[PDB]
Amino acid sequence: PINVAIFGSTGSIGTNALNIIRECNKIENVFNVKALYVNKSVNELYEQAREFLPEYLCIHDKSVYEELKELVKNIKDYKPIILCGDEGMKEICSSNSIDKIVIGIDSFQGLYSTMYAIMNNKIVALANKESIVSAGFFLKKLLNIHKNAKIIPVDSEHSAIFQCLDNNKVLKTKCLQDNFSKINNINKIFLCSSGGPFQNLTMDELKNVTSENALKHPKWKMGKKITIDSATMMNKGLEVIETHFLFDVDYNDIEVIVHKECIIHSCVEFIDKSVISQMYYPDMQIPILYSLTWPDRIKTNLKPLDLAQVSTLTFHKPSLEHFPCIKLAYQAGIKGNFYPTVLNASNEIANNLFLNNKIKYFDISSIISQVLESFNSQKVSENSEDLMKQILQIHSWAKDKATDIYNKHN
């Protein structure tokens, strides 16, 4: 039985993880949910605690710790270890009774739990792409220290790539490891995207888009941050850099394709030019389940893909004029150093400004571009404690710079 912790259990990823775990457990007891960790959602965490009865409960926001302990007392035949903040998160990661950890915490904040899970040689089912984008080089370093840890990608495109690969070769390397793509005979990656809600808008129409309309994603139901990112295709931009770090694929070998039906989740071209792709309905349960079962697969009762009913699959190039965020991500990635950290941080600020109706669509990339331009390359610290400190400092600088740029205009 696979012992799992779910970090960000009450969010979009975390709810889907519990969904597929529940359905798989119907027949055979395959997963034991040992731990659940949220920020503030006490009532929803208690409802999940009632169903899954995990050994550990943890809430990041200490102000709702008492509320949680109180609700939980109403559950019969149950004495969980109820924990708090970073200290709680670190205690969960250090537990011998947890094998795999799903990271469904959003934004840069997800990096902390990712780091600690790795330091405790856990299997990390990583949905949080921001951590790879802001700290890819650091994570590679960390994984070469903690040799029994692994990152297994949960992001659907990266799970798709992972699945298309031959496990006979995947097993001889590790995500983030040097030469991953060489060992796997990868020539290039087609990173598939729904294209978001604004794919058919003209330049003049785009100028005027609002966050209410950005939140109406045509294919995926997700948290607010990634949903806004999908509308600007900054999501895809972050995923380009994520592809580079996870799979050691050169930036010139990663191609973004708009596939509006979202059935094909990504494709791998091998050195012989044969292409392999993974397909399913747009549904995070598959990539989540795969991260927890890899290198095996288990039976589900999910709806089978009906190719005949789907009928048509379409593909086109994205316009970099209409979606300049993609261009900025490639540029930041190609530059290397801490440019991805600065990209991620400034986007977190610009994404949230747009969400809250403070700026326009094209201001998002304008703010990001300006922060990237302002940043000066830094010497990369050789030890991991120093490097994490350096990452946090640059991430914090970039966020303040973005806000400063916003403050100067509006």
Ligand X SMILES: O=CN(O)CCCP(=O)(O)O
Query: Of 220 and 397, which has the nearer Cβ to ligand X?
Result: 220
Cis ω for the linkage preceding 295 (within 30 of 0): yes
Query: Of 96 and 309, which has the nearer Cβ to a second copy?
Result: 309
Does 172 bind Ca ion (CB under 5 A)? Our answer is no
- Reading the block at residue 228, the tokens are 């806004």
Q: What is the dihedral of CA 125, 131, 192, 198, to 10 degrees?
A: 130
Question: What single-letter amino acid sits at 397?
Answer: W
- The DSSP output letter for 54 is -
Does 130 bind Mg ion (CB under 5 A)? Our answer is no
Return the closest-CA partner of residue 17 out of 26, 6, 2, 30. Answer: 6
Binds 409: which of ligand NDP, a second copy, Ca ion, none (CB < 5-8 Å by kind): none
Query: Of 157 and 363, which has the nearer Cβ to Mg ion?
Result: 157
Helix (H, G, I), strand (E, B), or coil: what is residue 122?
coil
Sort 296 into a burial class: Cβ within 10 Å, 0-12 / 13-18 / 19+.
Answer: exposed
Query: Of 193 and 365, which has the nearer Cβ to Mg ion?
Result: 193
Spatial contact of 44 and 50, defined as CB atoms under 8 Å apart: no
Q: Which of 2, 84, 183, 276 binds a second copy (CB under 8 A)?
A: 276
- Reading the block at residue 334, the tokens are 């190609």
The Cα–Cα gap between 233 and 217 comes to 12
Which range binds Mg ion by CB under 5 A, 152-160, 250-258, 292-300, 307-315? 152-160
Q: Which of 155, 242, 248, 348 binds Mg ion (CB under 5 A)?
A: 155
Does 19 bind a second copy (CB under 8 A)? Our answer is no
Q: Which of 8, 104, 196, 237 binds ligand X (CB under 6 A)?
A: 196
DSSP characters for 227-239? HHHHHHTHHHHHH
Which range binds Ca ion by CB under 5 A, 34-42, 189-197, 293-301, 374-382? 374-382
* Interface residues toward a second copy, by CB under 8 A: 163-164, 166-171, 185, 187-188, 190, 257, 264, 267, 269-280, 286, 289-290, 293, 295-300, 302-305, 307-308, 310-317
Which residues fall in the annotated binding site? 10-13, 39-41, 129-130, 155-157, 194, 217, 223, 230, 235-236, 239
